[PDB]
Amino acid sequence: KEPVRFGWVKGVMIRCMLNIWGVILYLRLPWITAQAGIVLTWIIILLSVTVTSITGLSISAISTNGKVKSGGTYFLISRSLGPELGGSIGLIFAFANAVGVAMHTVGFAATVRDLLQEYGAPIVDPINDIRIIGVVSVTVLLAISLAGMEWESKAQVLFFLVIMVSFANYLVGTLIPPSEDKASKGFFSYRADIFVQNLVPDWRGPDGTFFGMFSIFFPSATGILAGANISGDLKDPAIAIPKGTLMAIFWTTISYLAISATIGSCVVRDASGVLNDTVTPGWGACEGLACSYGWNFTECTQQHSCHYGLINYYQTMSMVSGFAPLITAGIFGATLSSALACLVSAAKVFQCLCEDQLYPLIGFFGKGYGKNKEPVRGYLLAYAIAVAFIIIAELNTIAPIISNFFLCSYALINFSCFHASITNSPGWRPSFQYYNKWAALFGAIISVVIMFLLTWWAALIAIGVVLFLLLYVIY
Amino acid sequence: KEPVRFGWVKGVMIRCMLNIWGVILYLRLPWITAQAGIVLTWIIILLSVTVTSITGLSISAISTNGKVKSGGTYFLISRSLGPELGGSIGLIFAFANAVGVAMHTVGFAATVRDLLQEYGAPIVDPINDIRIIGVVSVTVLLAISLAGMEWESKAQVLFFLVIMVSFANYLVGTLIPPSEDKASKGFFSYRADIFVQNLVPDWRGPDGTFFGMFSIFFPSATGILAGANISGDLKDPAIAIPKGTLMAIFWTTISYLAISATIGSCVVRDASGVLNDTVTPGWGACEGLACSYGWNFTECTQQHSCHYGLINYYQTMSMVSGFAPLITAGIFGATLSSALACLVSAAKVFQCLCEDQLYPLIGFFGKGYGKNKEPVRGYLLAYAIAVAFIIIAELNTIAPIISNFFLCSYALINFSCFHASITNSPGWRPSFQYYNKWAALFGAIISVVIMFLLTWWAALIAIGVVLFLLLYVIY
């Protein structure tokens, strides 16, 4: 009974694309497009996908160096900077993945709760909705993931199809001439006037700055290592990991640019929401862009007190669409798939750390064999952390620390590549064509600059945890 | 012709006491005593002299381990964490010392300029006063330091005597019943009412917070390594360095407490400065503490627009005194002595780095022998940096980076002691009685906490410079 192996389009490309896409695509990108206009939004996107392209090239170069087992992403850190930054960064990576599982299942449970609160009676508590729904969802994901690897692959293909259907729904919705309901909320079809008026920023509110929008977006463009954590479950990784990872990054960035450039030329940043604001012939004068189509939104701009339009209403994308519930389906598919990718990623790193002879820290976790060619001993450890961080259910303060645990790995992977390449390390001969030491050095420096720049105390906590593990292991 | 060696009272105690005392004693301590009252000022002092007591114990333990040449303070860093944090921290230490020479000579030149601007015609430029005076003063200090070591010792004893004379002048001045000039500016003799009213804070202005006052004070309590940088010029360092350094710290702290507790019970925090504010019998009512003695300062407190009193006038200590010019003499002696101690400290570390075989980075500086048992090759290097940072003459922005170069050494010295003591390093047997690994660990952790807490970007620059030197030396 041979194990199942995957090609490059279902085992690498789909996984990375589905882990990069989140709910920022559906709830915040249309808002960032309004705060910062179109050109600066493109600049933010192209700055974010430059760090993850350099890390992508380093990962691709790592993959063409030989055969590495599923979850041996930190082996280069270990054999280039000693086996005590190997295990420490591996443990940080595999703990942050198992926390990201919870930070996604909570986001899915929030949507389920929001739908339940309108269509029927919820159960008594306002926040225990999230806890019960999150725990049930995590148990279902654990069950399907523990039933094999073909089943996880089929579920991921299903989520991909649902996301594509939501994209098509959006794109055919924007081409429909506006109805009164859609017009009165700020939607007109592709107009040249609304495109030009939206190319320049309009910073509004306490969080409306270029660095604020960069800090909102950047953590949702990472997630490129989801096809390299299962390196051993591919038919030939040395051709499948470079091409799959880079195609994922390319197509994700294209979809990020198209959505902003199209939503930025259909909706105005201010709208009333009440249909009694048509033009009255002889209403003195009106000030605003929308009069030339037949709508009068002066009271908003004078008083700054309406809830609709691109800059005020967070769910504009779900009202431009032809059929609204398909966008909710897209949100479900974009959140569950990220949770599943993170749960399969944290299992295959705990299972590599539990069988690492050179890092005996947690090698004592073995009681039951579970020999089904599956990491049963690495799934329960991830499940326990995932549930323990769903019971808390309040995770907006832990997000910076986890997001910096994920950049302490982007720094050490890139620096391990550079250090092994300048030292001429004995056994480091990557054959990937597009790779350079100085690009890796730049990536390793920027990944620390950004990490301290986003929030300075969480970066210190992230460094302190790694340093404590390092020192306790040495002594 | 044997070289000259010093005892423990002139070679260690005087040097450390004179480098700890600065112009904060004369221009800012009476102000901090008014912002934060008396109890919190004592708390600030006793928190600052806890980091430098733990570092003092680590230095004392280092000194009883054997014989170390003049300027080998970093040898423990080198033989406990490799010879590439040895030289890098040694270079950072000896560059920050040679910059502190400039940051003190500029402070002396400022006082000379301020006196010149009143008693006669200055030369044409307002800021070239500082440049010319600073360069001349540094050349005079270099000349006396380069003429030998006995002459430097005699100059330091002279500065010590001048500081003691200013202290006596102050202390006999506060016991004189007030004159009208001194009363109208806010000075009354030791009163019980002004003591109680001044025990509690009164935070005023943009910089008036507990952390603001800690950040002003703390960098002026360090400077305890000035008697350990000349370890080889002592008759027996293993008895002279512990006792001298700890007695310096003790007596400095006593003088810091006495000045604040006595200036806090003689002056009120608000005064007018004009003698027409005596009590007029029948002036309705007056509100304020000073009426019961016979002075009426209501207009100040109502309008917040007067320049005198403890909290508003920075030179209160120079008007309480019996004879004002002796306080100026004390300021001269407190600034020149710190410049001289730093110039002798940076010479004897550059001269140890130029003859270090295991750190060949700057070993190429040797052209002229200068064999006079004096570091002629290490004095010109310090002089060039000192002059280059006096020509700039604007140093209030470089102060944080230098002050963090001085804590990157307090961290590594303490951690080197701890690491060598837990590893049971082969050759580390300190016989100092009062020493503990965990005290050193606490010192090494607090020295980084404070370093990032004072200003977060300058700490990153200070770490980046050390890391760049480390990496460039390895490759």
Ligand SMILES: CN1[C@@H](CSCC(F)(F)F)Nc2cc(Cl)c(S(N)(=O)=O)cc2S1(=O)=O
């Ligand atoms: C969206 N994620 C961001 C973190 S930003 C949100 C935060 F968690 F910070 F709150 N980074 C990564 C990176 C990787 Cl490499 C992987 S993965 N599955 O390849 O190992 C997963 C993730 S993520 O899904 O957690």
Ligand SMILES: CN1[C@@H](CSCC(F)(F)F)Nc2cc(Cl)c(S(N)(=O)=O)cc2S1(=O)=O
């Ligand atoms: C007053 N100094 C403070 C720095 S605070 C002012 C700043 F420079 F930061 F702006 N720390 C030290 C420490 C030492 Cl050990 C030595 S010394 N001569 O023993 O080597 C000298 C000094 S200092 O004189 O520079």
Ligand code: NA
């Ligand atoms: Na997803």
Ligand code: NA
């Ligand atoms: Na001094």
